[model samples]
Structures are given as structure tokens and as C-alpha cells.
Target: QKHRVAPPPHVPGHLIREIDAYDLDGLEQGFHEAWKRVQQPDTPPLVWTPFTGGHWIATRGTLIDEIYRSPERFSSRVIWVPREAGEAYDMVPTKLDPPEHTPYRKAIDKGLNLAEIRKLEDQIRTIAVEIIEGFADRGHCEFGSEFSTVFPVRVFLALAGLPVEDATKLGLLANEMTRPSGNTPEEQGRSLEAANKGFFEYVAPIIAARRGGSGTDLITRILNVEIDGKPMPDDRALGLVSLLLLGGLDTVVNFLGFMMIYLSRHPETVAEMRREPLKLQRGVEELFRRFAVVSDARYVVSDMEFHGTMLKEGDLILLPTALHGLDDRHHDDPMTVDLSRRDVTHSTFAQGPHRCAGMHLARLEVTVMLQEWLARIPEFRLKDRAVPIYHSGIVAAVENIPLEWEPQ
Candidate 1:
């Protein structure tokens, strides 16, 4: 009731389905399964929800992909749901549209692009091994705090040339940005601004020190990039690096947590992964398709008719990666995860000119997590009587997954 609003005039009564994308009733089952409440066989591909200040949820994969790729009709200016929060989210490339988005995307790409990620592969794998080995000897470990969260933060610090001691501080800020603490949009927006402010303040001094330096850290490399023949300014540099920090600290951390939760329930899949490590490369795709978690939105720039619905200018439409990955129309028996499925597909990183510029690094990190984890730990399972905690937000995450295995 705190965030609910009456449906707009153009919205039909039947299309008004009351669902909160950020908070669901049965998240203990799984976030993906919970989202299926809206994607029921007879449900409309698109529906209006009065929750979170009212917005449209694109329930089908095809429609979500179509909307993501169409910036002309759907602007990226405000990419968060509950419009107020997005209005406050001022990350560089993600907050910028096409022509303006291009340069910042290119500059950030210089740091995380495939070639750059390739150079860091050995170091990334090393980080994964060290983190897993730190707990592999223990009979039980909490996947979220002990492994999933630690691995990515270490890798990011190594990349950014920041002290590993700074991990806790940065991780807390990142958590606030993705899983903001609030019951309503206004509260959430303020939380998001506080998180972004933390990043800005933290990075400002470091950026100043790195400016004009010839160091090889990811932050330094990005700082030295030219923007339209001129060196990037401090404000834009702050935005790009702030966005990078969130990217580094958040997405993979939550994703790896969900992936481990899935593996704990499916030891057979883990056995197959251990038996044939190379097959895991393909299996990771299935995992990505099955565990897709981001749920961001786009702004409707002008009045338009989309998928047989009228959307006025400034309306918000959510394109959840969960819907795209779990839609039966796109993948038969979508809920069932077949590691060997040949046609696994999902837009977890999104599409369009604004497709995730850090995708290369994201894939590399997931691959490293799987390869290194299976190498160190034997078959693991969720601890008995343990309840995993799920936080639903712009990014869905499950934490406190207690996994137990025989110590080597």
C-alpha cells in the first residue's frame, strides 16, 4: 500500500494485475519461479502493476527483448523502476542514450572489453582458487559471504588497484545500490542516491591521484582515455568509475550466489561438471539462461502503441531478465535446466546499443567461478534446516546458502 497507485485511464481493468516485482510472496521457492506468477500460460505478455508507483511488466521474452532493443520508442534516460529511483540513478553510460552513451561506453569498454579481460584471466582464476581454497577445507561454508561475494570483490580490487582491505566498505555500498533498503519508491530513491554518493566520494580522490598517471590498473587506463580528442573530465570519470564499481561489486556477486544455490540442489549437475570440465563451458550458458536475475526498466519517450497496449510518454516498462530466460515460448520447459540444452538463450546482459559493455568480464568471471569451484570442492549440498535468504530488487540475490561437503 505504501507504493501502490491507481491504474492509468488507458489501462484496462483486466490488465491490472497487482504484483510487486521487487517483493514476492514465495521467493523461498525461487525468484524465477515466483516471476512465473505473471507469465502464466493465459496471462498477457504485458500487464500493468499498480505496485512500485505503477508500471508495466513485459511478461514475455520476445517483448522484453524487443523493448530493450528499441531505444527510439523506449529511452534509457531513466532505467530504474519506480521512476523516482531511476531519476536519481545517474550512472554514466547506463543513464545516457545512444549518441551520448557511445563515448562513455567506449571508454569503459577499454577497461573491461574482451581483450582486457583476456589479459586478466590468469589473475581472475587465481583469485577464484585462493578464495575457494580458503574455505574448501572447512566442512561447511556460507556461499554468499564466504565465497560468492568475496571472489568478485577481490578481483575488482585487483583490477582497480585498490586495497583488498577496502572490500567491506565498497561491498556494503554496492549492496545498497542493488538491494536498496526501503518499502516505498521515495525511500528507495534516497537509498540509491546515498549509495551513489558513497561511490562518488570514494572514487573522487582516487581518480584525482590516477589522472595523468601511466599506471596499468583498470581505473587508470579508463582515466587516461580520450573523449572526442580530449582527455575525459573528472565528473564524467567519476560517473564511469562509479558505474564500474557497482558492476564489479554487484551483478556477479548476486548471480554467483544464485548459481551456487542451484548447484546445491542439483548435485547430479555438479557431478557431470566435475566429470567433464570442458562441458561446463556449454553448461555455463544454460546456467546463465536459467539464473538470469537483472530486472531494470526503460522510459517511454513518447505516446506509443506497443504489443497491443497504449503507453504514454514518461511511463515505465520493466524488462526483467528472469522473464526472458524463463518464458516458455522462447525455451520449451524453461523451468527445467538441462545443461546440455542446445538452444539455451536469454538476454541477461540486455541488448541494443546499450548492451552490457562489461559482458566479456561477466562471462569470464562466471566461467572462472565454475572451473575453480569444482576443482577445489567435491559434491556439496545445502545444510539441513538452513533457510537461504532472498532479496528481491533491481537485481535478485540469495544469500546465507550454507553448503556442506566432505573435507579433503
Candidate 2:
């Protein structure tokens, strides 16, 4: 763990300072400013700041793409920095290197195939409509607490064939795991451990029942898939199930919550979507690109030169998807919400071997939700001066997005 080479002089003091300060709230804005400054053609050359164990921050799109594509060079093991480094918890498969990562990825992908996803779309749409209708009639309702948060939890439970009664329990656990607000790392660690154990124990009986040939749902499909020559282990199967529940429940829940808030604040975008409903898919893509919400980290395996600076092996690189998506070099007017933007490729679902396994299912869920909402509440708007509170960190979302619509 020798120190990596010093950061470039052009690297802003504020950016490096904010990171070292553990100023989570300030880092978002500071990181954005640093990225903007780095993009300037005349700005002093890009530098690698030694923030949280000293990893290279690929400011440019090309460099980011290069690092992401070559897993051989920059391994995913350190994808999320170790808890000792003060980073959030790591995710399996995402944190696993190739070979070992491949099988679990394949098994999960197979369970979410197009045919299986299509069967869930109608049901997902019905759920979306019901949730929207619940609040659309009210002049205003907390969109996140009332709709965005609740819808995805139920969808995941139904899809996993888990008991719906446990949806709230799982959802609460996920929130605590991802967004712990404790005074010390130990406090947060204990909370996460409890949540992890709760999830594992909860899924244990289900896994046993599925293995006994009593349950025939997605979890069973995963339990039943074999890699190489042997069936996946029960623990691995259980871990994958827990991963899916945590991922499927929280990411999109926060994403949709953010999307609705953006739409509410930008009425023109909402009107545009209503005019051209077919653009819903592109719209969802644009939203994900613009509001890339997840903050993931990656590990560099060996000493190497990045942006003219030497980065040593074993460094934990922070890949904030939200910041990467907002890079101006990658998109025109990166801060502006453009539903019509084309030629934009996003790593919101991520890139390379660890790309989101449930991307197709998520796309379908988002598309259906937007299409149904636009068709039903064509003139929707935030109600009577209601304010939406924004939440941040690994998952950026709205706690509540109160909205209302006029009757046709």
C-alpha cells in the first residue's frame, strides 16, 4: 500500500480537501467543479489525488471507458473500497473478479430473460397505475414515500415469489444498509451486519423450500442453474437472492423518485413526454444518464500510468456514476435534462463484465411506469407549494415528491 504518485498541480485544492475532510455533502459539488475544471483545454494537466487510499479519478470520458473495459488492468475487487477505508459496503459479483464473477452473473441474467420479463410487464404496469392513481387524485402526495419507494419493493417481492408482507422489512433493511447515518463506522457496520443477517435468515427457508422442489419462481430458477458442471451452492444462491433484492428494490426506487421530482420541476419535459409517448424508452435512458445515481468504487490491480500520473496497485478508485454521467465531455450541456438527446451511451447500469444483470427488467419497469403515468395524468404538477426533500450518498433520491394533477 505504498503511496501513489502525487496528484497533478491542476487538481483543485477544494476537491482534494473536501474528500479528505470526509465532507460527504460538500464532495458532490466539489467533485463537479473539479470535473468541470479538468475538462478545460488549458487547465493544468489532470492529476490523481490521494483521497481515501489514493486512486486515480478518470476525469475524461475516453480514460474512464479505457479503465472500465480492461478488467485485466484495473480489477473490480476493489470496486467498492474496503469498509476500513470508510467507503460503503461492497456488492458481490460486482466485487468479484472474472471467472468467479461470470457464473453468478450468467445465472442471474438467465432468470431475467426477455420472456420472463414480458410476463411481469403487465403486472408491473398495473401496479404503477394503481400507485399513481392513489396520488393523482390527491392534489398532492409525497411521491417517494407514497409511490416510488413502495412500488419497486412490491414488484421485487412479487417477482422473487417472496411474501408481500415482508416487503417493508426488506425495504427498511436496504435503506439502512445503503444510507447509514451514524457517528462512527462501527455503529454503521453493526447496523449493516444486522440487516445482512436478517436478509440471509429470511431467505434461508425460501431457498430450502425451492431446493426441495416446492417453489418455482425466479429464486428457484437461480437455485436450479448449474455452472460448469455443478449446481450453485446454497449460500451463493442465497447471496445472489439478497443482492437482487437489495439492487432491484433500492436503485430503481430512488431513480424513479428522482425522475418524478425532475419532471415536476421541469414541466416542459413532462409535456413533451405526453406529446410523444413512444419516446418513453429514450426518456428513461436520458434520465438515467443525467441522474446516474449510484456511487460505486473499483480497485486497481497494479502500478500504472493514468492521465500522466503513476497510480500504484491496491488503490481504491471511486467511480461515482452520477458524476461520470454528468461529465460535459460525454454529453452536450450535461446538466440540462434533454429527453431528446441521442448518441449518448451511459454506464448507469454500468459497463463491462459487471453491467447490471436486471437492466432489461428495469428498463421495462421504467418505461411502463412513465407511459402509464403520462397517459393518465397528462397535466400533472407538484401540488400547492409542496416541497420535495432530496437525499444523497451512494443512492441519491427524494424522500418525498408531493405532486398533483388537474382533472380532464
Winning model by TM-score: 1
The TM-score, computed over Cα atoms with residue i paired to residue i, of candidate 2 is 0.86
Candidate 2 deviates by what RMSD?
4.3
In model 1, state the lDDT of residue 295.
Answer: 93
Compute each candidate's TM-score over C-alphas.
0.97, 0.86
Against the true structure, candidate 1 reaches a TM-score of 0.97
Superposed by TM-score, candidate 2 places the C-alpha of residue 106 at a distance from the truth, in angstroms, of: 1.1
Which window of 10 residues has the lowest lDDT sum in candidate 1?
Answer: 24-33
Please, what are the lDDT tens digits per residue for candidate 2 over residues 1-408? 222335555444543422321224333343333334444544322334454344444555556556677788778765532244233343456667788999878888778877778889888998888887876765566777787877887788888888779877887878666665444445555666667677787777877778737566778887777877887777676677778788888888888876776688788888888878767667777887766666655676777766665556766555656545776667778867888888567667778888778888888888888887777777767666665565544455556467776754
Per-candidate alpha-carbon RMSD to the true structure? 1.4, 4.3
